[PDB]
Amino acid sequence: KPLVGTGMERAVAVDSGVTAVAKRGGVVQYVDASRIVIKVNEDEMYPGEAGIDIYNLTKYTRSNQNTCINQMPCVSLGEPVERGDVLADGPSTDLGELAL
């Protein structure tokens, strides 16, 4: 992390599409280096379809500039995640900040 920042790291990191941010909040159900499975809270759930959220993290792919764009999970198992909170820290990101 920066350790002397300006409070704009969080917004910059979340406002690009790099980090896998939660669409409907819930409770984490299964974490892994290759995917995350989030159990949606029933209140937010649609009337049917018994949905859960699956997030397929990207693993070691080439960028345009020949760099490695991966995504590390940043939540433990059983961890409640609310709507709009990051899960995967893309390159140069740290807990959803911007670590250059």
Residue 54 pairs with which residues in a beta bridge? 37
Q: Which is nearer to another protein, 35 or 41 (CB)?
A: 35
Min CB(21)–another protein separation in Å: 19
How many angstroms separate the Cα of 77 from the Cα of each of 21, 22, 50? 16, 15, 21
Min CB(14)–another protein separation in Å: 20
Other CB atoms within a 10 A radius of the CB of residue 4 amount to 5
Interface ranges with another protein (CB under 8 A): 2-4, 30-34, 59-60, 65, 70, 72-73, 77, 100
